[PDB]
Design a protein around this nucleic acid. Sequence first.
DNA 1: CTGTGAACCCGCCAAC
DNA 2: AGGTTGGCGGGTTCAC
Length: 111
Amino acid sequence: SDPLAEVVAWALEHLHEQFDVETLAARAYMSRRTFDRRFRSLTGSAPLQWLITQRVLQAQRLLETSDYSVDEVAGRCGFRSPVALRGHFRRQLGSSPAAYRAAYRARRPQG
DNA sequence: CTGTGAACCCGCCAAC
DNA sequence: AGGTTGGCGGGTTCAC
């Protein structure tokens, strides 16, 4: 029975919502400073970095599986604006959302 | 790009 | 003499 773990699982399932890190902290019955420390010490990353990281990976999935527009995806991935999506996506994957989907559909027409 | 304002987040450290 | 906690300061990142 692990509340730090339970909140991580909860985050994944509920990536599409937008929440304070302070929120996650509360949902894990910890002070911020504890949450922050214990999170990183478990996760390898800090909360909103990990959030971003995860949200991006969901974008990557939707860009592969679905036909939602880049702008429709940012919403489904919890990004507050389509401009933030491009930003974090480009930074950790190496190309824009569209350009990534474009290369994929070409290289792997079949899925 | 540029700019303002808020959020994060990690070292430091006294305090259990 | 081992360890976890949590406010606080404020550079860096995020967001618009």
